[PDB]
Every structure is written in C-alpha cells, then in structure tokens.
Design an enzyme around this catalytic site. Sequence first.
Site, mmCIF file in Angstrom:
data_model
loop_
_atom_site.group_PDB
_atom_site.id
_atom_site.type_symbol
_atom_site.label_atom_id
_atom_site.label_comp_id
_atom_site.label_asym_id
_atom_site.label_seq_id
_atom_site.Cartn_x
_atom_site.Cartn_y
_atom_site.Cartn_z
ATOM 1 N N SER A 111 -39.192 -69.214 26.936
ATOM 2 C CA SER A 111 -37.881 -69.298 26.315
ATOM 3 C C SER A 111 -37.804 -68.354 25.109
ATOM 4 O O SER A 111 -38.329 -67.226 25.157
ATOM 5 C CB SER A 111 -37.611 -70.764 25.924
ATOM 6 O OG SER A 111 -36.421 -70.929 25.188
ATOM 7 N N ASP A 315 -30.698 -71.217 34.637
ATOM 8 C CA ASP A 315 -31.753 -72.190 34.853
ATOM 9 C C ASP A 315 -31.464 -73.485 34.093
ATOM 10 O O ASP A 315 -32.362 -74.300 33.890
ATOM 11 C CB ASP A 315 -33.125 -71.607 34.447
ATOM 12 C CG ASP A 315 -33.308 -71.490 32.932
ATOM 13 O OD1 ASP A 315 -32.336 -71.631 32.155
ATOM 14 O OD2 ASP A 315 -34.453 -71.233 32.509
ATOM 15 N N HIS A 356 -35.377 -74.536 33.278
ATOM 16 C CA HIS A 356 -35.939 -74.166 31.979
ATOM 17 C C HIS A 356 -37.074 -75.098 31.504
ATOM 18 O O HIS A 356 -38.048 -74.646 30.903
ATOM 19 C CB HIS A 356 -34.831 -74.148 30.931
ATOM 20 C CG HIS A 356 -35.090 -73.218 29.793
ATOM 21 N ND1 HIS A 356 -35.016 -71.845 29.921
ATOM 22 C CD2 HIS A 356 -35.419 -73.459 28.500
ATOM 23 C CE1 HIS A 356 -35.280 -71.284 28.753
ATOM 24 N NE2 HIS A 356 -35.526 -72.240 27.876
#
Length: 386
Positions: A111, A315, A356
């Site tokens: 991320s 995502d 994610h």
Amino acid sequence: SRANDAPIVLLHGFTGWGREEMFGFKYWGGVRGDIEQWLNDNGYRTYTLAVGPLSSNWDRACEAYAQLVGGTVDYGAAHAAKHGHARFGRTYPGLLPELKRGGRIHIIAHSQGGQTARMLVSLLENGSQEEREYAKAHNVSLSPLFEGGHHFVLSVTTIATPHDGTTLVNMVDFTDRFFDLQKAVLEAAAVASNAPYTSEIYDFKLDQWGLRREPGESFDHYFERLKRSPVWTSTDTARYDLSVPGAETLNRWVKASPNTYYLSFSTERTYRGALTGNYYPELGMNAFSAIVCAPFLGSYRNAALGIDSHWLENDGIVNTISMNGPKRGSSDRIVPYDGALKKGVWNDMGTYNVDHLEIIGVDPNPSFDIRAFYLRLAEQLASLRP
Ligand SMILES: [Ca+2]
Ligand SMILES: [Zn+2]
C-alpha cells in the site's frame, strides 16, 4: 539459485504497527499467520519496520532511516520549519548496523508503504537539495539522509501501492470513512475502538506533532481528535500523498534509482457491470471495503484529475491502474516481467485477484496461497544479481 544475501525489510501503509503492537496480531500476515516468520523459517532473513501510519511519506522515510541505522529521527530543519512540527522525533537502536558497514536490503512494501520505500531510496541516493541549502544558509547541522550517496537498497517491491494515488480520498465523507477503515482493521485484529484501553496497543507515532492517545481514551475518541489535527489537515500528511494530486507531487521528485531493482504487484477484486463501465466488489472482498469504498472507487470519475473508465477497476482501497508504478508526473519506466529482472525500471509482476487487505492476510481468502506468494517473492529477490 541465490545471487545475494541481502535481508528483506517489510513496510506497511496507512495502517500498520510493530510486531509487539496490537497484542502480537501481525499486519504482515493478519489472520493467516506471520509472514516475516514464514520467510525467516525458510532461510530468508527478514525484519519489519513500523512508522507513522498517518504521517507524510517524508516523515516515514526519516523514521525508517533512523530505525534502520539507529539514532534520533531528524525530519530536516527546512521541512520542520516549513510545516511547523518538531525537527527531532523518537530515537531508535538500529535494526541493521550492517548497512553502515556496506550491506544492502530488499524492501517489500504494501500500500502507501510503496511510496515511502521509493522516497527513502531517493533520499538515500540523492538527499535533499532543499535541506542541504537550508543547512548552509542557517549553518545548522544536517542529517546524512539529506546528503546523498547511500547504497542501502538493492530492491523495492510494492504491493497494491497507490503510485498515482487513490480516488478513495475524493469521497464526500472520506474523513469519517477513512477512520472507520482504521476501526475495521482494529476490529479484524480483535481490538475494539470504543474500549477505554489504558495500555499502548497501537502507537500512531505522532511524536513530531506532539499527538498521542491518552490512557483510558478510546480509539473512537482519539480518532475524532486526529481528524481535527495537523496530521489530517496539513499537506504534510499520508492523506495528501495518497491523493491523486499529492501522489503526482511525490512523483515529480521521487524517481527510480538506476542502482536499484523495482518490482510492483497489482491487485483487483472487482467485476465490471453489465450496461455500465462501472466496477463492483467481488464476492469475498473484505466487508468494509465492499460496502463503503469499492462502490465509490468503481464508479467515481473526475475529468480535471483524468479519472476515467481505466481507473474504476480496484482492490477495494486503491485503483488498480495506480499500482504498476508511478506514471503521473513521473519519469520512471514500467515494463512487464519477462523472466529477467532489470535495474532502475519498474518490473510489473502481474495483477492478482486479491483485495487490499487479503494480500497481507488481514482478511481471509482460502483460494489465495499467501505463504507461497511471499515465499516465491523472497526467492525472486534472493536471485537478484547484486
Ligand atoms: Ca476475503
Ligand atoms: Zn513532516
């Protein structure tokens, strides 16, 4: 076969905590287990960084640097004066003294961690002209992080990273939903946001802003204060860097080093709708994303920001198009993985049908072999020619 012995270093995004935090529930592995442990157990030496989840990538990079080599975090005299927070932060013992003796590392980043990793390399190699010039103007001391010349990083791997930002930040009630996301992650780790916890649990490491949760203060009440604080309202924030304009700002100076390998992994957990160009959350996406975030990501368009039909696949948190590498305001190049990894360019390692939080094991997904994913990656990093 193994062409290098460089250790792996793990680096979280806009949520994340140390291995001693959250009662030992790991960001890297979540409900699935302990990724750093899987790697170490298979002969891939591995460490975990923990930095300010909500802080700017700059702040996080300075924190990572001091955390790696030891010493007191120094955010730079120019930076601290510009944004009005403390120059010096917390002190670290130093994870890897081998670095100052000439060792190197692989950074694997999830991320927003991917922006931090890129920026750290940029600072390590080139330093900061703004900090150098400020220090010469005022005759104050200068952190070696701003001088350049470090060869610490052999590779950077980003997983589900918003290199070009995420349009999640453009949601009408983004502020409330962002902190609801923080609470959803807490909940996934069996920590309540309405409990008046007296012990530490999740340090947001906001030393520089002088911000900290009080003993007996719930994460609900704490987050309301953070919302009104400079780590949410200033440009010197994860929030700004996460935005499409903020990501491009980052991209205009944070470039790929030719001495470093770059790998990117992209993620999607959506389907395209029937009579529309919109994208919709798949069965199995973590519930918070599926309900709160994914519908917006898969339908929000914005002509001024160039957010069109290509940005809608996502995502649950980040638009998939953003993940293969920096492109907005970037001079970096991206090439599809063709079997041989190349220095100084983004190697797009493919797109995975994983959301994610699933990719780090914080949300379950039985069809995703998370152990094999990271073990295969470690093997690829160990094969890199120094
Ligand atoms: Ca799932
Ligand atoms: Zn700062």
